[PDB]
Amino acid sequence: WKTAFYAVEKRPMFFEQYEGGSSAWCVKYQFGAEDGGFVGCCEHGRILQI
Amino acid sequence: WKTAFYAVEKRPMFFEQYEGGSSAWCVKYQFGAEDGGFVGCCEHGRILQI
């Protein structure tokens, strides 16, 4: 797995109040994160199935 | 009435500029308050009718 697959990390989670839409009663919070992944040469590795 | 009917108050009326929906050419304002009441010993008072 040190060469079969790969994970790219860009930005961890973030939380923030969403000003606008907040009508002094319904406080609306927003959050997000960003990252991804992909495969290397998918020959190093196999899958045992029935 | 000092013991027949009770009026309960929670929050004096509050105002606030409604952020969101208010822009460089308009302003939105929003107010609210919380009050209520109930009867105490309604065996105290009496009513006169026809």
B17 interfaces chain A, CB cutoff of 8 Å: no
Counting Cα atoms < 13 Å in the Cβ hemisphere of B32 gives 9
Name the method of structure determination. cryo-EM
CB proximity list for B15: less than 8 A, separation 6 or greater: B29, B30, B31
User: Helices marked H in A1-50 — which ranges?
Assistant: none
Resolution (A): 4.0
What is the rounded radius of gyration, in angstroms, for the C-alpha atoms of chain B?
20
Tokens encoding A20 = 């606008």
Which residue is associated with the tokens 């590795």?
A45
Counting Cα atoms < 13 Å in the Cβ hemisphere of B40 gives 10
Q: Name chain A contacts of B32, Cβ cutoff 8 Å.
A: 24
Pick the residue from chain A with its C-alpha nearest to B16: A24
| Rounded distance between C-alpha atoms, residue A40 and residue A1, angstroms | 9
